[PDB]
Structure formats: C-alpha cells, structure tokens
Amino acid sequence: DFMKNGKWYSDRGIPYRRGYLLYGPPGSGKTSFIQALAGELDYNICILNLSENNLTDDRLNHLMNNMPERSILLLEDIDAASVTFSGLLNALDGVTSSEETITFMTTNHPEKLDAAIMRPGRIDYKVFVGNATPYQVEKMFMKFYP
Amino acid sequence: IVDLEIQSKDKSYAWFLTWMAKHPQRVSRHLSVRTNYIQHDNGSVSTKFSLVPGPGNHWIRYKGAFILIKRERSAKMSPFETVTLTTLYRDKHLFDDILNEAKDIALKTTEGKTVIYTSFGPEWRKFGQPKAKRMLPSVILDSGIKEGILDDVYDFMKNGKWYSDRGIPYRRGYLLYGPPGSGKTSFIQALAGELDYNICILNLSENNLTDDRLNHLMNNMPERSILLLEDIDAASVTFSGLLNALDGVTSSEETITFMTTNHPEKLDAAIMRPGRIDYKVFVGNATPYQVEKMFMKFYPGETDICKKFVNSVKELDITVSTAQLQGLFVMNKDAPHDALKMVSSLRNAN
Amino acid sequence: IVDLEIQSKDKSYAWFLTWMAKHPQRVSRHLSVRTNYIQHDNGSVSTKFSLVP
Numbered sequence: 001d002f003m004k005n006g007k008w009y010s011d012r013g014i015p016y017r018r019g020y021l022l023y024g025p026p027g028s029g030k031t032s033f034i035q036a037l038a039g040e041l042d043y044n045i046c047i048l049n050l051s052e053n054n055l056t057d058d059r060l061n062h063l064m065n066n067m068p069e070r071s072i073l074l075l076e077d078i079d080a081a082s083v084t085f086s087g088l089l090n091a092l093d094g095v096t097s098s099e100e101t102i103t104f105m106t107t108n109h110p111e112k113l114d115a116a117i118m119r120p121g122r123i124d125y126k127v128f129v130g131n132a133t134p135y136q137v138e139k140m141f142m143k144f145y146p
Numbered sequence: 147i148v149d150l151e152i153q154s155k156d157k158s159y160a161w162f163l164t165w166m167a168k169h170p171q172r173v174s175r176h177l178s179v180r181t182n183y184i185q186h187d188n189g190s191v192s193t194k195f196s197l198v199p200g201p202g203n204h205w206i207r208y209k210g211a212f213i214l215i216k217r218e219r220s221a222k223m224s225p226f227e228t229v230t231l232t233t234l235y236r237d238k239h240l241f242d243d244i245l246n247e248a249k250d251i252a253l254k255t256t257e258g259k260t261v262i263y264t265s266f267g268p269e270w271r272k273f274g275q276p277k278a279k280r281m282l283p284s285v286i287l288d289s290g291i292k293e294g295i296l297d298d299v300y301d302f303m304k305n306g307k308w309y310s311d312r313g314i315p316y317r318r319g320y321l322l323y324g325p326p327g328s329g330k331t332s333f334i335q336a337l338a339g340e341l342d343y344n345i346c347i348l349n350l351s352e353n354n355l356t357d358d359r360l361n362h363l364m365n366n367m368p369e370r371s372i373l374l375l376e377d378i379d380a381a382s383v384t385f386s387g388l389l390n391a392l393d394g395v396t397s398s399e400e401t402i403t404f405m406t407t408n409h410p411e412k413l414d415a416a417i418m419r420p421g422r423i424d425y426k427v428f429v430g431n432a433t434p435y436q437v438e439k440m441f442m443k444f445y446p447g448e449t450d451i452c453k454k455f456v457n458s459v460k461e462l463d464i465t466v467s468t469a470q471l472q473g474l475f476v477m478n479k480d481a482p483h484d485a486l487k488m489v490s491s492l493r494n495a496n
Numbered sequence: 497i498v499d500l501e502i503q504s505k506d507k508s509y510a511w512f513l514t515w516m517a518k519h520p521q522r523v524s525r526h527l528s529v530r531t532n533y534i535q536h537d538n539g540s541v542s543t544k545f546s547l548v549p
C-alpha cells in the first residue's frame with residue numbers, strides 16, 4: 001500500500017517515507033523476515049550501525065539521503081543508543097529527512113526507546129515478533145518435515 | 147588580445163557547470179560518465195547515464211564567440227577540496243550573459259521547492275536536492291495559532307526601517323514548544339515555503355562546532371533564509387557564546403530564527419529572554435478542532451462521518467497526537483468508515 | 497631603474513584591494529566573479545554580481 005500510493009502522499013502534503021519496527025525476543029525471525037521481505041521486493045538492504053563511534057550526524061544525514069535506489073534501510077538494535085539523539089530524530093523525521101525510503105528497526109528491549117522515536121511519523125508500524133506459538137511450531141515442522 | 151576569468155567553489159560554480167552541460171555547441175574534448183537510475187513512475191524502473199564533460203579543454207561557439215573552458219581539480223580531492231573553472235575570450239560582453247543564463251537555469255530548478263542548507267565548518271551548503279513546498283493548509287494547528295504567527299512574521303518583515311529608527315536589532319526569534327508529533331517542524335517547513343525562504347538547519351550538539359564557527363555561520367547565512375534550531379534544549383559550543391550570538395554585539399541582522407522543544411522547562415531564563423525568543427507558542431496535542439480539520443483534509447466532503455469520528459475521539463478520552471491521527475488515516479486510506487472503526491486503535495501506544 | 501613593494505595580511509591589504517577594484521584605469525588581465533544578492537528594499541529582491549579582478 002505504501003509503495004503503490006506514491007502520489008497520494010504528495011497530494012496531501014505528507015513525506016513519502018515509512019518506518020517499520022519489529023520488536024521481540026531473540027531468535028524470533030526478525031532479521032530473517034527483513035531479509036525475506038527485501039528479497040521479495042527485490043530491494044537491497046543498506047545496513048547501518050549507529051553505535052559506530054566514527055559516525056556523525058552530518059554523515060548520518062548524508063548516508064540516509066544518498067542511499068542507492070530500490071533499497072531498504074535497516075537499523076538492527078536501535079535501542080543501542082558520536083551520533084546525537086536529536087540528530088537521529090531529525091534525520092528519521094525532519095527537514096533533512098530523505099524521501100521515498102523504507103526503514104526497518106529491530107529491538108529486544110523496546111522499553112528503552114523513548115516516546116519521540118516511537119512517534120508514528122518515525123515508526124509508523126510496530127509489530128511484536130514474539131516467541132513460538134503452536135501455529136508457528138506446526139508450520140515449522142511442515143517446513144522441515146513436509 | 148585576450149581576457150580571462152577564474153572561479154572556484156562558489157554559488158555560480160555549479161550553475162556554470164550546469165549551463166555548460168546543457169549547451170549544444172559543446173565541443174568537449176574530455177568526457178566523463180554520470181550513472182543514474184530512471185524511474186518510469188510505478189510502471190518500471192531502469193538505469194541510465196549521462197556523459198558529463200570531463201576535465202580538460204573545451205570549446206563553445208556561444209552566439210558568435212568561440213569560448214574556451216578549462217575544468218581542473220586541485221592536487222587531490224570525498225572531503226572538500228577546491229575545483230576551479232576558467233573561461234577565455236577577448237570581449238567580455240557575453241561573459242555576464244552566460245553567467246545570467248546559468249542563474250536562470252538555477253532559478254528554474256528551485257521554482258516550487260524550498261532549499262535546505264546545512265552547517266559544514268564556518269559556511270553553509272545545499273543539502274540534497276530541493277524538496278517540494280509543504281503548503282500551509284496541509285498543516286492543521288489549533289485555532290488562531292497559524293494566523294497569529296503569520297501576522298507576527300509579516301509585521302516583522304514589513305517593518306524594517308521602524309526597528310532602525312528606534313534603535314532595535316532587526317532580528318526576531320520564534321519558539322514552538324510542545325509534545326512530539328504536534329506539527330512543529332512541519333509548520334516550520336510550511337512557513338518557509340510560504341515565504342519562499344530557505345531553511346538553514348543547525349545542530350548545536352555537533353561536537354566540532356565552536357563559538358566562532360557558530361557566529362560566522364549565523365552571520366554568513368544565505369539571504370532569504372530562515373534559521374532553524376531543532377531541540378534547542380539539547381545543550382563544544384558555550385552557553386554564553388550561544389546567548390551572545392542570538393542576542394549580542396556579534397549577532398547578525400535581518401534574520402529570523404525558529405526553535406523547537408519538547409522540554410521547554412530545561413531552558414533557562416536568559417535564553418527565553420524576549421530579545422532572543424520574542425514569540426513563544428504551545429504546539430500542543432490534538433484538539434477537537436484539529437481532529438475535525440485533519441479529517442476533512444484526509445477525507446474531504448465526509449461531514450457526518452467527521453462528526454461521528456470526533457464524537458468517538460472525545461468519548462475515548464485520550465491525549466491523541468496529530469501524528470497519531472495522520473497514521474490512522476494513512477492506514478485507512480480513502481476509507482473514512484474504516485478509520486471510524488479503527489479509531490479505538492489510537493488509545494493503545496505499545 | 498624600478499622600485500617595488502610587498503604587503504600581505506595587513507590592515508591596508510583589504511583597503512588596497514578595494515582601491516584597486518574601484519579604479520577606472522584598471523587593465524585587469526585576470527578576472528574573478530563575486531555573486532551577491534541585491535535587495536530593492538521591500539519592493540523586490542534579485543541576484544547580481546561583480547567581476548572582481
């Protein structure tokens with residue numbers, strides 16, 4: 001729906017940018033699902049590590065603005081947080097924020113994240129990739145033992 | 147018998163390069179390649195290229211004048227490093243003409259857009275391609291806030307000499323404090339687009355920033371621009387240096403600055419002085435007026451459905467933000483009934 | 497038969513540059529460009545330039 005409705009965002013003056021969050025326990029299939037969705041859309045993942053010390057706010061903004069086309073931004077363990085909190089917030093949703101980009105975030109400790117980062121404008125969709133459930137167990141068994 | 151000119155690292159430099167590139171009488175003896183992806187809307191996407199001229203000697207027959215051009219880099223280059231352009235001919239009465247045509251090409255691109263400038267050392271530069279204007283009616287705020295701010299800004303811009311005659315610095319500062327996702331920065335964008343000004347975003351938490359660099363940046367801003375300080379409560383810059391820069395001897399003139407916070411309580415009294423922050427506005431959470439007008443914006447014509455939606459929102463008794471409403475309407479795109487059904491989703495936050 | 501002088505990074509340096517710039521007998525064989533915005537008060541605003549030597 002987001003990818004198809006391109007002009008609809010512009011006609012109503014919204015930034016054509018969306019962000020997804022997949023929070024859950026470890027080994028729940030989060031990053032695997034990121035890989036699979038990127039493959040399904042034929043997009044290229046642009047992994048980014050914010051805990052990188054040499055990273056700076058200007059470098060961050062340039063990187064998120066000069067991404068290769070047909071790509072998905074990935075921020076594994078966004079709860080880890082030279083980058084600044086305000087700089088990150090403005091980069092995700094702000095004047096310097098880019099356009100026509102999809103970003104995916106993952107955590108095991110969503111409680112650490114504040115309210116501003118979890119704003120709908122920055123994290124539009126949030127999903128709980130929880131532990132295994134009987135449906136998941138059954139379907140995994142069929143996958144491995146058809 | 148011949149005359150020449152040099153320029154490097156200047157506003158006209160890129161304008162000049164674009165003007166040379168488009169020109170059909172180019173006799174470029176050295177070429178380059180610029181690869182780019184072409185998007186055929188949602189129909190398809192493919193990759194293409196453009197043979198930008200390379201460094202070396204190039205001839206142009208500009209309306210009866212055989213002009214030679216020379217592009218060369220410094221010893222090295224992608225950190226900033228000087229690149230210069232030269233142009234050779236006897237008569238200069240076509241020189242300014244070429245420069246004006248390059249200006250026109252530059253103006254064409256920045257027609258319905260708002261340029262954004264960023265701080266890189268003691269001077270600014272454009273950040274990325276320009277973005278389309280965020281028209282003010284798209285920005286839904288509480289009653290009278292937008293009108294009051296616009297009236298204040300127009301009064302300030304128009305009354306230029308009045309400040310000087312009475313010995314006041316012709317500089318004004320606005321503050322928009324409120325919860326996240328309340329439309330602050332969106333309103334900044336919209337006002338900048340309405341005035342046709344260019345935002346010069348500045349991050350003070352930047353460690354490499356210094357007081358002298360700060361003063362130079364706020365004094366060498368491009369004209370017809372608005373300074374923006376997102377999250378001024380974040381605070382190598384010094385408190386006294388910032389205070390003097392905003393309102394002090396070294397402070398510039400004929401500038402408009404906008405500040406935003408979610409924690410105005412952190413700010414001290416001196417920074418909130420009227421001379422530095424003349425106007426302060428509370429961009430609070432959504433109110434029934436804002437909810438209604440947002441619904442009309444996203445679902446025009448749906449009046450009764452709006453009435454039921456606002457009644458349900460009131461009955462929910464939640465401190466819903468404007469961005470939450472935008473997200474809900476985006477989920478239920480062109481589906482007012484679905485938005486009414488999912489109205490209960492706003493209550494949850496985690 | 498001829499005499500000379502040097503100066504660099506001095507109070508008179510910029511003063512000297514301005515004096516050379518205004519002078520009408522300049523035979524400047526090398527030129528530059530200085531772009532600046534001209535404000536016609538509140539009536540209008542436009543961008544112009546000056547070919548500094």
Ligand SMILES: Nc1ncnc2c1ncn2[C@@H]1O[C@H](COP(=O)(O)OP(=O)(O)OP(O)(O)=S)[C@@H](O)[C@H]1O
Nearest residue numbers: 025026027028029030031032033076077106107108
């Ligand atoms: N839902 C799932 N579907 C398929 N394979 C899964 C799933 N969950 C776990 N796995 C397998 O177990 C591995 C661990 O899960 P991952 O998705 O790699 O990590 P994750 O904990 O889900 O998220 P992060 O970002 O790695 S903490 C995967 O690489 C798969 O081999």
Ligand SMILES: Nc1ncnc2c1ncn2[C@@H]1O[C@H](COP(=O)(O)OP(=O)(O)OP(O)(O)=S)[C@@H](O)[C@H]1O
Nearest residue numbers: 121284285286326327328329330331332468469472
């Ligand atoms: N009053 C509003 N009018 C229009 N759109 C709004 C409004 N409030 C929120 N939005 C939407 O939700 C997003 C979040 O609001 P923003 O204005 O970007 O952030 P803000 O929290 O208001 O201020 P900062 O500086 O980002 S903390 C906007 O980009 C719009 O898409």
